[PDB]
Design a protein around this nucleic acid. Structure first.
Ligand SMILES: CC[C@@](O)(C(=O)O)c1cc2n(c(=O)c1CO)Cc1cc3c(CN(C)C)c(O)ccc3nc1-2
Length: 565
DNA sequence: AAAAAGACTTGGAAAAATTTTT
DNA sequence: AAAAATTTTTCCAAGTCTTTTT
């Protein structure tokens, strides 16, 4: 069965579902204590830890190879959290982390990882079958007349928080999620999932205004985490289709918005000038609407509305270009945004006024926040927010670049190179940067030797065709002419093979510091890709893998080769 | 309001399983 | 067969925007 939810009458506003039934979450397996021979040492002397304290110790031991375990913040936060898990008898002995020895514990886990890759075919297939039967029973929920898959039904096991970038809470313990922390959401007429025996759920609710099945609060940030349906479901896919339709509606009114914000740079009021400059930044450079965050709780990262004076450096002339704004800051996930961008005269002049009488720690856009900006965007067009510009600019750039880089007469490997260069332009615009693959970038040597070995085969084939043509001169007959034909086809087959290898080598080189995944799955109206694939006869499986094909099932079925964003 | 909460949106590096070279 | 290069799951957070509290 294949449910085409996209052919149904669109789901009404307010209510998300009428019926909802699931078996609840799968809890992480219990902690298995260390055997007798794996010893922990404090001040050089043997010490057996209580299960609760031993568990927290194993987490640090497993991370001993990383440099972050030597960091002040990591160690401070870890030790404070490990103390809470210790008994009173253990707290009187273990005064500090530095006198502790986790070396035997670290070696054991490395030995287990080695003992696991040396498992038998009977053991390997068994664990794979235990995993598959867990997916049949708990990986599916029933939502309104249909069986839909659940994304992450297995709750993440306990461990140590690290986060991304320079996070103030690195080292902290992420405690084991218990049934007592779980809030279940289902309909009043559904069979309520039973908790593990000897346990109870925190709450069983019936809120049809939300899309989640299970929720709980995590101890690091104090936020609510959820278990929702998978990307191939109606509830996720319809909202994704709507996100793209909203981005298409912005397209038909973007010049009208551009002309107004350009005029708003000249306004009498400062709040209107700042709002217009911030809008320009979100449009031209596709910056995220930086929401304000609590200091000392998260890693110091900013976006457009949260930019500080220290994040921009103004230059009247740089590189022979007029009115350059040197952007240098950490955006989402602590990914550095560096750009030297030529702006209009009025923006540069406006930026000099927003930087007047301010200290480096002060906000560039005072009197402005994401709420004020989105309240204005909502008046310009219904349902328009700041992130819609990122979606619009990404999708329109993909469409225009595929239209400009794709050559009709090219073979499939060459067209995939044109597709990837177009996706690359989107990733550069969105700043989806990447650090060169951990050494492993020397796999460019391996590709070059295979290319040089193929250039050898081609050069040998050209010598065969050369002597076949010379043998066709002396004693010209229809038997020697057919040998020249077969040698020409042999040169042709080898030329195509080399072309494919050289195209793959270029693809990897240009993609060294670029991450394509995020724009491909979140930013890029899949219909633009489907339309391109059908137009040039490029099979969809060459662009989207199995999981992406399932998420974008709606676009693959409902989209002609003539679709225009 | 305007903080505080709640509810959605937005992988890539490392492992491991395979596959290919040797 | 055994080392090496690939293709595929496994691990682990952070923003945006909407809705409630204070
Ligand atoms: C790396 C790119 C990115 O950070 C991003 O913002 O551009 C991201 C992260 C994550 N995801 C994505 O789709 C995307 C891309 O759009 C899904 C995801 C799941 C994560 C989970 C799993 N949860 C949902 C159960 C974690 O536990 C920790 C971090 C996680 N990070 C991500």
């Amino acid at each position: 069965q294949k449910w085409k939810w996209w052919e149904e009458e669109r789901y009404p506003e307010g209510i998300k579902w009428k019926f909802l039934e699931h078996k609840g979450p799968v809890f992480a397996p219990p902690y298995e204590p260390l055997p007798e021979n794996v010893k922990f040492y404090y001040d050089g002397k043997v010490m057996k830890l209580s299960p609760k304290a031993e568990e927290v110790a194993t987490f640090f031991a497993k991370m001993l190879d990383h440099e972050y375990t030597t960091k002040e913040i990591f160690r401070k936060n870890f030790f404070k959290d490990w103390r809470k898990e210790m008994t009173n008898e253990e707290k009187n002995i273990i005064t500090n982390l530095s006198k502790c020895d986790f070396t035997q514990m670290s070696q054991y886990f490395k030995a287990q990882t080695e003992a696991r890759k040396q498992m038998s075919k009977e053991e390997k297939l068994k664990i794979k079958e235990e995993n598959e039967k867990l997916l049949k029973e708990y990986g599916f929920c029933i939502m309104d007349n249909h069986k839909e898959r659940i994304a992450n039904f297995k709750i993440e096991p306990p461990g140590l928080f690290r986060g991304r970038g320079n996070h103030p809470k690195m080292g902290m313990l992420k405690r084991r999620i218990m049934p007592e922390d779980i809030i279940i959401n289902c309909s009043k007429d559904a069979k309520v999932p039973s908790p593990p025996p000897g346990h109870k759920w925190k709450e069983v609710r019936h809120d049809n205004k939300v899309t989640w099945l299970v929720s709980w609060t995590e101890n690091i940030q104090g936020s609510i985490k959820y278990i929702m349906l998978n990307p191939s479901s109606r509830i996720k896919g319809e909202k994704d289709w709507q996100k793209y339709e909203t981005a298409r509606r912005l397209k038909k009114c973007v010049d009208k918005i551009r002309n107004q914000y350009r005029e708003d740079w000249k306004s009498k009021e400062m709040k209107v000038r700042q709002r217009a400059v911030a809008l320009y930044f979100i449009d031209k450079l596709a910056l995220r609407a930086g929401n304000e965050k609590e200091e000392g709780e998260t890693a110091d990262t900013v976006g457009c509305c949260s930019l500080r004076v220290e994040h921009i450096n103004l230059h009247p002339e740089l590189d022979g270009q007029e009115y350059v704004v040197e952007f240098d800051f950490l955006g989402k996930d602590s990914i550095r945004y560096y750009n030297k961008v030529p702006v209009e005269k009025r923006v540069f002049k406006n930026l000099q006024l927003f930087m007047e009488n301010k200290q480096p720690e002060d906000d560039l856009f005072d009197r402005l926040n994401t709420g004020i900006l989105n309240k204005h965007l909502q008046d310009l067009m219904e349902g328009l927010t700041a992130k819609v510009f990122r979606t619009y600019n990404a999708s329109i750039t993909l469409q225009q670049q595929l239209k400009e880089l794709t050559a009709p007469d090219e073979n499939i490997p060459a067209k995939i190179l044109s597709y990837n260069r177009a996706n690359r332009a989107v990733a550069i615009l969105c700043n989806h940067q990447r650090a060169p693959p951990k050494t492993f970038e020397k796999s460019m040597m391996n590709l070059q030797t295979k290319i040089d070995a193929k250039k050898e085969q081609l050069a040998d084939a050209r010598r065969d065709l050369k002597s076949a043509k010379a043998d066709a001169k002396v004693m010209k007959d229809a038997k020697t002419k057919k040998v020249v034909e077969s040698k020409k086809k042999a040169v042709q087959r080898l030329e195509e093979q080399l072309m494919k290898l050289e195209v793959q080598a270029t693809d990897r080189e240009e993609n060294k510091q670029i991450a394509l995944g995020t724009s491909k799955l979140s930013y890029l109206d899949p219909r633009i890709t489907v339309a391109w694939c059908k137009k040039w006869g490029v099979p969809i499986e060459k662009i989207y893998n199995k999981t992406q094909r399932e998420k974008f099932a709606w676009a693959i079925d409902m989209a002609d080769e003539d679709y225009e964003f």
